[PDB]
Write an enzyme that holds these catalytic residues in place. Sequence first.
Site, short mmCIF file in Angstrom:
data_model
loop_
_atom_site.label_atom_id
_atom_site.label_comp_id
_atom_site.label_asym_id
_atom_site.label_seq_id
_atom_site.Cartn_x
_atom_site.Cartn_y
_atom_site.Cartn_z
CG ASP A 1 -2.31 0.68 1.05
OD1 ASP A 1 -2.11 1.78 0.63
OD2 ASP A 1 -3.29 0.26 1.70
CG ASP B 1 -4.33 5.79 0.93
OD1 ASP B 1 -5.25 4.89 1.50
OD2 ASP B 1 -4.19 6.88 1.78
CD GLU C 1 -8.64 4.74 -1.21
OE1 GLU C 1 -7.71 5.44 -0.80
OE2 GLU C 1 -10.00 4.70 -0.47
CG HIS D 1 -8.69 -0.78 5.00
ND1 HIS D 1 -8.42 -1.18 3.45
CD2 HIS D 1 -8.26 0.36 5.09
CE1 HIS D 1 -8.04 -0.06 2.92
NE2 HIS D 1 -7.65 0.73 3.75
CG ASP D 2 -11.05 2.54 3.95
OD1 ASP D 2 -10.71 2.78 5.21
OD2 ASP D 2 -10.43 2.83 3.07
#
Length: 558
Positions: A98, A199, A255, A328-329
Amino acid sequence: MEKQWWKESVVYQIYPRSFMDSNGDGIGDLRGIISKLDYLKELGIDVIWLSPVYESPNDDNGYDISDYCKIMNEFGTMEDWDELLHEMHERNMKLMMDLVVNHTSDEHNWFIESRKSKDNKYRDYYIWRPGKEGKEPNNWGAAFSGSAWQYDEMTDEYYLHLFSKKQPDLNWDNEKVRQDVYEMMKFWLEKGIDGFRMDVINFISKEEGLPTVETEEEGYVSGHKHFMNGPNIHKYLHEMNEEVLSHYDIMTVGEMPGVTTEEAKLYTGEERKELQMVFQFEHMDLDSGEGGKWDVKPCSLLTLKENLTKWQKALEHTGWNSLYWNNHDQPRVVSRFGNDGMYRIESAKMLATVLHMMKGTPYIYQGEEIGMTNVRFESIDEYRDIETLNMYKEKVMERGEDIEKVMQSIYIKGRDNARTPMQWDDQNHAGFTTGEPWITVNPNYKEINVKQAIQNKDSIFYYYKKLIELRKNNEIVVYGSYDLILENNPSIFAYVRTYGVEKLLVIANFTAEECIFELPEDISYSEVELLIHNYDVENGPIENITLRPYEAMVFKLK
């Protein structure tokens, strides 16, 4: 266009902190992951994407990075990491890291120096601006509540943080910063990693002048219009590509909250030389209203299929799609779009069918393969996430809203729904830890866990495994085109994949009620083969099929 390994891959995302604990502290770690390697290989995973494992104060569990080249204390050491890479490469798996580069921790050296003075060399590594009247430079708000500007007496200016105060934004219009970030990227690329999940990379380019948002509102408002797919975003991603990305055989995915199908074409077009794919949020915001994610709205199957179909069609000839339901969000699928009660197993299988039989690279979030559910803790003290906690103070403490309603939106949209420990077995903490977990394990682990799923061939685990196998063994599922049928049917999600002379007919009932599927006269076949199904069906003909609740099935025609 061209066949690529990353186009044929299946990715499994692991949130290290909640995957597997091997040393009794209640927080997952690298050694714990290593021990599960054979489990993931059984599933059929090709690529493993690890949420951040770098040094961090943990204000946002890893996404606030103080040192990019060191492993987080709680996860282990660089040696544990090197062993993970090797054991993964030993098997034929690839490792995707990430990349959090829109901001760093406020405890990162660049920021430590940056705040000391205005004539400091690292000063313009961040976005510092003087107040306007006696207020902040503009009226933007941060993701986890409050202003996006934090005052610092040392210089009498404010620094920008789109996320928490401890996550100050890097200034990408400074080439030294871009050069440094590229240096840091090559460090990990030289170690042998196979990719980067980026990210919020479309937030990286801010609009010159950081304009106030034209509004008649009272407090802080989103300034997303001025940083979301900024003026130099394509120049920076292509620069990044020329300098770093193109030098290594890796896979990339950005993302991108707020990206549109047309922007996605510019971001992912093979010839644009920027990224290979992006995570869009359109399907993740279908159940949010005017006031954002907490303003929950019901989402119908029609709104869902229209949205998924649109992305399918938009990147059919250019770019490449990423396929995901959760991470995870986000809240867990079976609870969000499925039925996590009486039909948890059926609906989970149904949702997996729908997404895995589309065009693009699928991503599986840890726990998805065994049908993990959302969690309902009766008290705010059991929740851990800054976002949830900060939202609670604002709404309950500052706005004086009903605790019950606030808690209900947390049950539906809270990110902790996705971060409770992975459920390995029916032992004490679902077998995740021998100590005490950093966050409580969902009470339903006694029926929902990996060992139960691995000993029952009719489990969700085995369904996902077959889905992945089908994809590996049939080119049509990777390269075939997509076409939605029964477009306006409010109960059935159906479509066709066409590749050469073959076709795949995918039928999914999105409801708890029996309904009828009628094959369109337009489709003509001579040979039919049932590929996968979540119910016992000796199906034929396929002209008229009565679908049981949440029943789903895939056929190969001719």
